[PDB]
Amino acid sequence: AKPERGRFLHFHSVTFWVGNAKQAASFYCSKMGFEPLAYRGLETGSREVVSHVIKQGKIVFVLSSALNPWNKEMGDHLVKHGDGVKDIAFEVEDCDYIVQKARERGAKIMREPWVEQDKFGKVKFAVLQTYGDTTHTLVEKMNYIGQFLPGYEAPAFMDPLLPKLPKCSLEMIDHIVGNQPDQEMVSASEWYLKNLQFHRFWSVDDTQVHTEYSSLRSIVVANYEESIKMPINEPAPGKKKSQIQEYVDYNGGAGVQHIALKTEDIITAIRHLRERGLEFLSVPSTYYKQLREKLKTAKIKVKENIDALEELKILVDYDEKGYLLQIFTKPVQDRPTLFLEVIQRHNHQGFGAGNFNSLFKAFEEEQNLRGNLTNM
Amino acid sequence: AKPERGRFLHFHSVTFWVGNAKQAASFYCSKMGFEPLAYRGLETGSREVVSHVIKQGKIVFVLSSALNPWNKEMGDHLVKHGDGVKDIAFEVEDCDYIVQKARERGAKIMREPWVEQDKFGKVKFAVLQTYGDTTHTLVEKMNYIGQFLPGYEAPAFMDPLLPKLPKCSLEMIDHIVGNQPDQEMVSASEWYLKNLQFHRFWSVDDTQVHTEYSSLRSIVVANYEESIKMPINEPAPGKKKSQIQEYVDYNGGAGVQHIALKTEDIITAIRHLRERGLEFLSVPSTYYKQLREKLKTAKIKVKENIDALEELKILVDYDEKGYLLQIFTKPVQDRPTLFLEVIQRHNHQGFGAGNFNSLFKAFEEEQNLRGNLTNM
Ligand SMILES: [Cl-]
Ligand SMILES: [Cl-]
Ligand SMILES: [Co+2]
Ligand SMILES: [Co+2]
Ligand code: NA
Ligand code: NA
């Protein structure tokens, strides 16, 4: 059923609340191939919050910190979560309708619609509360031709190391995953269906994704046109603690687990990300032997050199029409909370339970290294 | 008067409490030429605190974060200060004497002497409280031949970008500066004299270091053998706010303002630091014209090419026997608290009021950019 009005066009940006915005922006630029896009802070008249905005392709990350001692909201969030995602922004049409419908349906509107303006045009915003402390900012451009948004200026500094580093080829945000406490997958996913008129796109249960020790459940929600996809996970039964529970343990509650970044040349992307010093999970050699055998009878043909996929530890899954290439980074902070994913799609716009299982097992290895794969 | 017993050999290390230890270590390695030395965290059995230890020459920085939500001590310090220095460690002989004398003299002993042991030998430690929330850890090696200390293991990861970046040539910690609130310079410096049997090494007042708008006072304390030098600053009068007060405003109290790192090849160091993307303060062109004229009658001869010093914005000061080359970085976080300095000494083991004045003016320019050079 197509929503009567409104559209969620694409992910706009992801806002992180971090301990040191300057250093965080530096990390993502150096290690992951981002470049500075915009800035606000003391030098631009923003006296409570500093933000470094960085971009790669269509991907926009906003790294923000408090400027003053004893900031209650940002300081509490920092002590609770460590560095992590605060807001997932969507570019929309008809923000007014979307907010009114969401309110009538029971969503909490943290910030009522407001308009900001600069010499490049106007932008309308609204803020809704989703799971945990995570929010969604709705962004409706009203003939806006600026490079980012009102209230942000050119970058504080253009680091001269960045043009010397190899291009990472990341193009856009593919999906974003939210981990929930035990028995909160349904409520957190229903939020989207009820309030935003998203629909259920995919799901897996603990009979599909599990190791000998642990498991999860997941429901993926999507907007009508399926340009926005968000898996929602919860822990599920096993002899040992689910990695989704490890996340909740270290995050202090629900929150964003991973942001997946799409590329059209994953071999180049991962080679270059590794050259820049980014770490990824691993996969046993047996996996690639099994893959080569299974590919002999698959209806699809993988065009990437399997030797390169093996060397780079990329995971392959397929249906009868196309295939998916996926790899997870190690967590981007010491708490085992947030990490990122690189994904390439070949005539496949969904998810694969094979890759979900393989990725789950690769993460579980690290969970056990951390001493957190403990008997229930 | 030589202390009856005990010796403070050298700075051992500086411990930072930061929001994201992994990213911070990455910043210092990439931008400033450090390499990983050691690690403790979940994978090594340290379940409350993660630490990434990095080294360059004799310089050792320890970047630490809390691993769990709602860590009181580290979380409060993070919200109060942002990322910054928690502890300045000294390598000592006769830790027992030093602690007992300090206690008798009135110092607060945060942690009584204790011994840790591994297969490389034993190390004795003690912790004393200095200004603000800053502590000193005393480190006495007892036939210890390990690369760092007990309780830390090999690095979590050796980033493969680092060997590809140019060498920064930093050798050892030269001095560390503590900024105090109004009228606390004397008490904070006296702490060293009374408790540790340091002595006054140098001082300047607001008649020596000032611009048209602002000023400071400083007292430098040193150990008997003068291997350890620590300037202690306070704000002083002016039409506008002192940069030392700006620090206190943003730090929430007293704390470390800058760590100075010594090099024997400052031209190479600064060229390579700039290539890696580190930002430094600036100096007007007039300064170098004046310098060239003054050098015509100086008793010393500067061996570095003055054109290179000008291009790199290095500041020169001298007495009749030798000279000092100094440059400040921009702050290493968005709050204008901590920054670093690179220093080269040529037959000059003290400080120069000329350079102190020039460095003060260079910082004041940035303070004004931040909107913090406000009328008193
Ligand atoms: Cl099974
Ligand atoms: Cl004057
Ligand atoms: Co994913
Ligand atoms: Co200095
Ligand atoms: Na599109
Ligand atoms: Na020595």
Curated annotation (Swiss-Prot), chains A, B:
List GO BP terms, alphabetically: L-phenylalanine catabolic process; tyrosine catabolic process
Could you tell me the EC number(s) of this protein? Answer: 1.13.11.27
Per UniProt, residues of the VOC domain are 10-141, 172-330
Citing just one GO molecular function, the answer is:
metal ion binding
**Cited Gene3D superfamilies:** 2,3-Dihydroxybiphenyl 1,2-Dioxygenase, domain 1 (3.10.180.10)
| Pfam families per UniProt | Glyoxalase (PF00903)
Tell me the domain of life: Eukaryota
The modified positions for Phosphoserine read: 203, 218, 242
- Sites where N6-succinyllysine occurs are at 124
Q: Where in the cell is it found?
A: Cytoplasm; Endoplasmic reticulum membrane; Golgi apparatus membrane
Concerning InterPro entries, the annotation shows: 4OHPhenylPyrv_dOase (IPR005956), 4OHPhenylPyrv_dOase_C (IPR041735), 4OHPhenylPyrv_dOase_N (IPR041736), Glyas_Bleomycin-R_OHBP_Dase (IPR029068), Glyas_Fos-R_dOase_dom (IPR004360), VOC (IPR037523)
Q: What pathway annotation does it carry?
A: Amino-acid degradation; L-phenylalanine degradation; acetoacetate and fumarate from L-phenylalanine: step 3/6
Q: How does it sit in the membrane?
A: Peripheral membrane protein
Checking PANTHER family in the record gives: 4-HYDROXYPHENYLPYRUVATE DIOXYGENASE
- For this entry, the protein name equals 4-hydroxyphenylpyruvate dioxygenase
Species per Swiss-Prot/TrEMBL record: Homo sapiens (Human)
Q: What is the lineage of its organism?
A: Eukaryota, Metazoa, Chordata, Craniata, Vertebrata
